[model samples]
Target: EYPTVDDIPVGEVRLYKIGDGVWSHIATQKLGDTVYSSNGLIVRDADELLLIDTAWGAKNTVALLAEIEKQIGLPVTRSISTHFHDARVGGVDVLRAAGVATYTSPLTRQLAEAAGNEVPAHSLKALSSSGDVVRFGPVEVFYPGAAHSGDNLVVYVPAVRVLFGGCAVHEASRESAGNVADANLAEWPATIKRIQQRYPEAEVVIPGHGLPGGLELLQHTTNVVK
Candidate 1:
């Protein structure tokens, strides 16, 4: 069954379960009267959980944790922020305070520091520029070069064939790259191509924002960047 989106207490944020042990926590930020959504992933193992990214802020992260704990009765022991942006790392402080180890790419750490946001305590080094694949339990963290952001990455769940293409891959609804200030526009397509080659079996692709879909989102993102 496909995951459903449910409204939670924190800023009316919603959580969507895309797979049996996989979920996406979407948080919102208000600018004036407009509310913007940010997406993240949550993967639960037998008794442990891994967060791909935190919600928009501490309050939302706290609420997300509460809801997850209440639902699965498991604690989030590790979290990997997809990038340095606030949407990805805004809850580093909160998670760290709760004794959850937070991790991010080296470039993300540098960018987060430059942006004056709280940096994660741990870093995931790319074994090579081609892309680094790290496995935490059943989830695979793939760094397929620079795209939307210099440090952008995606998570793959081999068991479920789901790819969490954090900010690097845009949803079909997105006609353009939302933020280009830190993006490698020229290299975006090549990076995504690498992902395609690496995980051709991915059945479900979840963008950092918007609805998830099949592999078509990858092509859509390539077109958007082009």
Candidate 2:
């Protein structure tokens, strides 16, 4: 079963594994009457680790790193924030302070910069357009146009057949696009379809804010956007 342990609580963050050597960080934020749970992915290979999102905010991010080091006994040599949102980049400062090489799409950097949000240190400027892909060891980052956020990005690990679709992919239980404040409604549907077409082998699709599922999760998100 995935999400090993359902799992350990690192303060406000919950750490769990979704695949062999592929872990996920879960955190919650309460804004008024709404409570949102955010998910982030981690991959371990050759004694190095990759962090897909920051895991809620700075404090929890700190806890996340310590827990990984304590439990997983591996250092996050590099990391990336999918977009500018707090759930994605909130702990980027911690990654930076710890000398963990960090990255963001150039567009994500731009959006986070303007919003005064924390962004990763480096940018994949080559990814100038949607459907652009860049590989970092066993992990791959793909920009499939704009969806949940103009700068949202997805991570895929072909070795594990898992796709972490950040906030751009909605959870299965969602009836409509959850947040449109920074979403690309006009292009969201096409963006999701691009992901499906790009990674048909993705047997485990993880959303930014919910449980992991199969291709049905991608279809559900596509339908919600339209």
Best by lDDT: 2
Q: Across residues 34-145, which tens digit of lDDT does each residue of candidate 2 receive? A: 7677788889879889888887778878888887888788889888888887768888999989889999898888888888888788988767788899997788889899
Clashing pairs in 1: none
TM-score of 2: 0.93
Q: Candidate 2 regions off by >4 Å?
A: 1-10
lDDT of 1 at 62: 84
Q: Model 1, range 1-226, lDDT digits (tens) per residue?
A: 3222333333555567888899887776655664566678888888899888988778778877887777667899999988888888887898999889998777788999999987999888752355788887768888898898888888999999999998998887789898799899999999999999999999899898777888989989989998
Query: What's the TM-score of each model vs. the native?
Result: 0.92, 0.93
Per-candidate Cα lDDT values, in order, are 0.83, 0.83
